[PDB]
């Protein structure tokens, strides 16, 4: 609505200034310290600027994809993708971000691979990355056994991917509103976790463009489970 | 010679601040939340505390509060280095006992100049 | 009002911050992959671009943060005795580079003798002066040798009347009312490639009105534009 | 030996693209907009054109259109380097005659190997 839009704008400022602080500080340090900076540190500091730019790029791509999905100008080119491979490549991309928060990234499969499916690989990779990122971002604060498990399964003439976690959990009053645009569960736990409230709004629209659905089951303290069903066949 | 307690949940932020602190000659001790910062104060008493606001377990405002109610910690200078760029956020920190507040993004040159000011006081 | 501007506004932020990032990323990877093939004067030049492009990037986030504050009734004025006469030259300096970069000349004169004292917030009026100056450069004539942005200082009605004149593209009459609205931009072929959120004037309108002042505009399509800023002295 | 036409309104982006092009021993001639780009084609014929979309005076789609209308300019390879990340933006440029479209922000390493592909 509006009160949300305002919070949303403030959230963009917050999430975007975190990598900018790094980019700006590391660059000025390299500039001011060329005389007292060995080669491996220079390369390391350069790598931070490059990595922090890539995260900053991904957040801008979230804003762009949302505006395209709002305007209804985003396509969906389907093809014969191996889904068992596609989840694994998505998990490899998160492994670095997962290691920062002490999160394990499991992939189990009930049906035997390879799992054939007629979907857009780029957009389903974006769906999985969003759910995997939320698993890491909204995990427990101090725990030794924090994980994000992706369970692949085949059901109802489709493909049922489940993203399980043992994180903070979602209350029942928020369980409906989590998929809305700009919505975030405002609490004492999630006060310092960055986010716009667009990820699940982008994920719901992408999944529903494929003729599929997404829903959630969660308990506060225990964890959350995100189920996403998509059809297999063309016709 | 001078010890500096670095308090921020971001590992990337801690590294670059630690680099510029070590480049002057200051030894640093790191803490990834407010509770660890207070736990490590039992080991040693720093000459300066670089403190973040937003972080899990314990936040910077409650750290700033707890530093004053204990007698041993209340006269240690505190520079608040934070992403919160509001005026009412600054005024709360200064009232809680912080000696200076700097906004992120920050200049390492201006930050070290302010670190020199409080240590050479 | 409309979740249509909102949708256009989200795209505009993405477009706007995507430019200094393209630079930051390209220059950083270039330095990283070409250490052996860069003299030292270029490495410092390339590092400086990253630094400058980040300052543009940051300025852009302060616009989003200040706007959110204005909307939440969080910003509040701390007034003091300042000389708008210098505070104006200052500002003008801070945009010097952006100007040249656009083949724009930033002038400054005063109809009354300086110094001109006034009880205002120097930080927030600097932000008002910068926004109007930066708009003069942004929306100047596309191909011309005599393009400029002139700031005129004056005293009127027991107040200080700052005018920001230019000879740029101008504004159509149907937009004259809507330019100060949040998220609004004049959509046209001339303002197609120009980046912007539509927050600057909305931010400037709230800052000036918190001082008990007002802002209005006169503009001519092709000739130029003039932004009048009246503020009480004390 | 190889000559590349760099067409972009950002002077910051022209510098870093020209640096990476000159790093591979290519010659670089720059252009501030689409109208200037076409004016310089009377002087010489480039082996590759790096083209931006969003420019004042004349945009990149207009350049891609007019490159096809002239006989001499039709077969010159064009890489579109642009901030416009839409799929319908890409399809328009490819139909207008662009050989490849790369989005901004970009990787200088990936850009240069794609430049090498069209020249070789
Ligand atoms: N895996 C998860 N575990 C716990 N909470 C979640 C999870 N995924 C989403 N949420 C909740 O839903 C809200 C919106 O999430 P999302 O739409 O992904 O945007 P963002 O992550 O940017 O806030 C969050 O505030 C969060 O509390
Ligand atoms: N000096 C000026 N000359 C011509 N047009 C202007 C000027 N200042 C503002 N405008 C018009 O007002 C609109 C909104 O301006 P503003 O609120 O500053 O946002 P933006 O950052 O998008 O320019 C612009 O789209 C522009 O067309
Ligand atoms: Mg923090
Ligand atoms: Mg452009």
mmCIF file of C-alpha atoms in Angstrom, chain D residues 45-101:
data_model
loop_
_atom_site.group_PDB
_atom_site.id
_atom_site.type_symbol
_atom_site.label_atom_id
_atom_site.label_comp_id
_atom_site.label_asym_id
_atom_site.label_seq_id
_atom_site.Cartn_x
_atom_site.Cartn_y
_atom_site.Cartn_z
ATOM 1 C CA UNK D 45 35.569 1.205 -41.686
ATOM 2 C CA UNK D 46 35.894 -0.550 -38.281
ATOM 3 C CA UNK D 47 36.248 -4.330 -37.838
ATOM 4 C CA UNK D 48 33.889 -4.128 -34.812
ATOM 5 C CA UNK D 49 31.366 -1.662 -33.312
ATOM 6 C CA UNK D 50 30.759 -1.581 -29.538
ATOM 7 C CA UNK D 51 27.370 0.169 -29.292
ATOM 8 C CA UNK D 52 25.308 1.644 -26.434
ATOM 9 C CA UNK D 53 21.503 1.980 -26.590
ATOM 10 C CA UNK D 54 20.675 4.957 -24.342
ATOM 11 C CA UNK D 55 22.425 8.025 -25.812
ATOM 12 C CA UNK D 56 21.332 11.618 -26.600
ATOM 13 C CA UNK D 57 20.921 12.965 -30.185
ATOM 14 C CA UNK D 58 20.764 9.431 -31.713
ATOM 15 C CA UNK D 59 20.198 6.144 -29.824
ATOM 16 C CA UNK D 60 21.631 2.663 -30.522
ATOM 17 C CA UNK D 61 18.530 1.132 -32.142
ATOM 18 C CA UNK D 62 18.515 4.049 -34.616
ATOM 19 C CA UNK D 63 22.219 3.345 -35.324
ATOM 20 C CA UNK D 64 21.517 -0.400 -35.787
ATOM 21 C CA UNK D 65 18.672 0.528 -38.187
ATOM 22 C CA UNK D 66 20.766 2.944 -40.298
ATOM 23 C CA UNK D 67 23.734 0.505 -40.375
ATOM 24 C CA UNK D 68 21.466 -1.974 -42.242
ATOM 25 C CA UNK D 69 20.052 0.663 -44.656
ATOM 26 C CA UNK D 70 23.548 1.563 -45.941
ATOM 27 C CA UNK D 71 25.248 -1.161 -48.015
ATOM 28 C CA UNK D 72 28.840 -0.650 -46.776
ATOM 29 C CA UNK D 73 27.931 -0.626 -43.050
ATOM 30 C CA UNK D 74 25.638 -3.718 -43.112
ATOM 31 C CA UNK D 75 28.244 -6.505 -42.652
ATOM 32 C CA UNK D 76 30.271 -4.797 -39.853
ATOM 33 C CA UNK D 77 29.862 -6.886 -36.635
ATOM 34 C CA UNK D 78 28.167 -5.124 -33.694
ATOM 35 C CA UNK D 79 28.319 -5.980 -29.979
ATOM 36 C CA UNK D 80 25.599 -4.145 -28.033
ATOM 37 C CA UNK D 81 26.902 -3.215 -24.555
ATOM 38 C CA UNK D 82 23.909 -1.744 -22.674
ATOM 39 C CA UNK D 83 22.295 -1.168 -19.254
ATOM 40 C CA UNK D 84 18.909 -2.282 -20.656
ATOM 41 C CA UNK D 85 18.572 -5.829 -19.278
ATOM 42 C CA UNK D 86 15.179 -6.757 -20.764
ATOM 43 C CA UNK D 87 14.626 -9.793 -22.996
ATOM 44 C CA UNK D 88 12.524 -7.743 -25.456
ATOM 45 C CA UNK D 89 15.424 -5.228 -25.599
ATOM 46 C CA UNK D 90 17.791 -8.050 -26.643
ATOM 47 C CA UNK D 91 15.436 -9.419 -29.327
ATOM 48 C CA UNK D 92 14.944 -5.943 -30.863
ATOM 49 C CA UNK D 93 18.722 -5.381 -31.175
ATOM 50 C CA UNK D 94 19.331 -8.840 -32.710
ATOM 51 C CA UNK D 95 16.519 -8.243 -35.246
ATOM 52 C CA UNK D 96 17.970 -4.770 -36.017
ATOM 53 C CA UNK D 97 21.302 -6.485 -36.919
ATOM 54 C CA UNK D 98 23.346 -6.773 -33.691
ATOM 55 C CA UNK D 99 25.562 -9.884 -33.565
ATOM 56 C CA UNK D 100 25.618 -10.031 -29.735
ATOM 57 C CA UNK D 101 24.063 -8.224 -26.738
#
